[PDB]
Amino acid sequence: VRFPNITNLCPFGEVFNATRFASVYAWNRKRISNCVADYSVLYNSASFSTFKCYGVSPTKLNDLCFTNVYADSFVIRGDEVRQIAPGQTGKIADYNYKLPDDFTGCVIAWNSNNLDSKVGGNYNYLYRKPFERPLQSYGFQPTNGVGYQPYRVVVLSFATVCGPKKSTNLVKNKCVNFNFNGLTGTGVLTESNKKFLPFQQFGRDIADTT
Amino acid sequence: AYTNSFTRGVYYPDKVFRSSVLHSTQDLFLPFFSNVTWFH
Amino acid sequence: KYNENGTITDAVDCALDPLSETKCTLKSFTVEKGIYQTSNFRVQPTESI
Numbered sequence: 001v002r003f004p005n006i007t008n009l010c011p012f013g014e015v016f017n018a019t020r021f022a023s024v025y026a027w028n029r030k031r032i033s034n035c036v037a038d039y040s041v042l043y044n045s046a047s048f049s050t051f052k053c054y055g056v057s058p059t060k061l062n063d064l065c066f067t068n069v070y071a072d073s074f075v076i077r078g079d080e081v082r083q084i085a086p087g088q089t090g091k092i093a094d095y096n097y098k099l100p101d102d103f104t105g106c107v108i109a110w111n112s113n114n115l116d117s118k119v120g121g122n123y124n125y126l127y128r129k130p131f132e133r134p135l136q137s138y139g140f141q142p143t144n145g146v147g148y149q150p151y152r153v154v155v156l157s158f159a160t161v162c163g164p165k166k167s168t169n170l171v172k173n174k175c176v177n178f179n180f181n182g183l184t185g186t187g188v189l190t191e192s193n194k195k196f197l198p199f200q201q202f203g204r205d206i207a208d209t210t
Numbered sequence: 211a212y213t214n215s216f217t218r219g220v221y222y223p224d225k226v227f228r229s230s231v232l233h234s235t236q237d238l239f240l241p242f243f244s245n246v247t248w249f250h
Numbered sequence: 251k252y253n254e255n256g257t258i259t260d261a262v263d264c265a266l267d268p269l270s271e272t273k274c275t276l277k278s279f280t281v282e283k284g285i286y287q288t289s290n291f292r293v294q295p296t297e298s299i
């Protein structure tokens with residue numbers, strides 16, 4: 001199985017490893033596009049307290065492709081993390097960050113008790129239709145309980161954003177089952193003496209045969 | 211102002227290498243000897 | 251018309267004239283003398299009733 005070099009990935013590292021996050025009332029919305037989106041890092045990494053997908057299976061994310069992907073990024077209190085899901089109600093679900101009931105995407109979250117919480121209280125995070133962007137602040141402190149810790153939550157709402165395709169080694173001069181880009185078949189791969197133009201990917205024989 | 215397109219307006223319809231062959235294909239091409247609008 | 255190196259060196263516009271139609275039907279840039287059937291003439295409707 002052979003595909004082009006897996007370069008040109010989407011900047012999940014600017015979303016999940018971000019220095020600063022927005023509040024839930026007015027969250028950041030970053031557009032993810034024009035890339036090979038590797039979701040295995042986010043899924044397998046033990047750095048997250050939770051990883052859940054609603055419209056799609058979380059393990060098929062690298063097989064799937066979405067027209068556009070959006071990262072809705074914000075900080076909320078631990079006990080309220082459960083509201084970031086379709087079909088929910090509550091302070092966030094109803095007044096700050098509402099998801100569709102037919103929502104397709106993945107919700108990823110982790111604690112930021114050693115990042116955003118401050119000894120005197122980090123009150124820079126404030127809270128009050130789907131994705132529709134008076135207020136009170138969260139008293140985030142490193143000494144509070146788990147349900148009171150700040151959590152960094154990123155919702156990836158789900159063509160230009162496709163999962164990665166891993167290639168295998170190529171074995172010559174033997175009968176193999178091959179997959180090159182968009183075509184498959186069975187045959188023996190040997191060095192050719194053909195001269196393809198720089199933009200040509202496949203060769204064709206007279207009677208429409210690769 | 212108009213000019214004669216002659217036999218130009220042909221492009222490789224795909225990314226397939228073919229050699230020593232006459233290949234028939236239908237695609238959007240500039241018709242031969244058609245008029246093209248000439249701008250200065 | 252593709253050459254040995256994969257480039258297009260010539261082309262026939264199959265609707266340019268009756269000789270081009272013959273060349274495309276025969277799939278050859280040159281044709282031998284003779285009479286060939288290449289198409290079908292049909293009188294078109296001019297109005298709608």
Ligand SMILES: *[C@@H]1O[C@H](CO)[C@@H](O)[C@H](O)[C@H]1NC(C)=O
Pocket residue numbers: 012013014016017041045
């Ligand atoms: C963030 O950086 C850490 C470096 O320790 C790496 O382990 C993690 O996979 C990165 N995640 C993203 C989305 O860049």
Ligand SMILES: *[C@@H]1O[C@H](CO)[C@@H](O)[C@H](O)[C@H]1NC(C)=O
Pocket residue numbers: 212213244245
């Ligand atoms: C347009 O093409 C026709 C031939 O089909 C030619 O007779 C005519 O003069 C051309 N028009 C102009 C403005 O050159």
Ligand SMILES: *[C@@H]1O[C@H](CO)[C@@H](O)[C@H](O)[C@H]1NC(C)=O
Pocket residue numbers: 253254255
């Ligand atoms: C193919 O390219 C070579 C140069 O690498 C040239 O010498 C040869 O004449 C070309 N063949 C044709 C049919 O144009």
